[PDB]
């Protein structure tokens, strides 16, 4: 005769993968921007 709650904790899981889903998009993004710049010159 009593009753219980529950809680959450965010675990390295996100400490890494979610921060990586910023760093690893913008950085591959940096590679893609470089590609785009080179293609622009090539097309010219």
């Amino acid at each position: 005769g009593q009753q219980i709650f529950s809680q959450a904790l965010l675990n390295a899981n996100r400490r890494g993968e979610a921060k990586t889903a910023l760093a690893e998009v913008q950085a591959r993004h940096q590679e893609l921007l470089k590609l785009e710049k080179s293609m622009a010159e090539l097309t010219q």
């Binding site: 590679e31 470089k34 590609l35 080179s38 090539l42």
Partner: peptide, 19 residues
């Protein structure tokens, strides 16, 4: 590794076209 390869090929092609 694929895209770097692509970048490398594009850079080579730019060189040939400048030539």
């Amino acid at each position: 590794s694929r895209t770097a390869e692509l970048q490398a090929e594009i850079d080579d092609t730019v060189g040939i076209m400048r030539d």
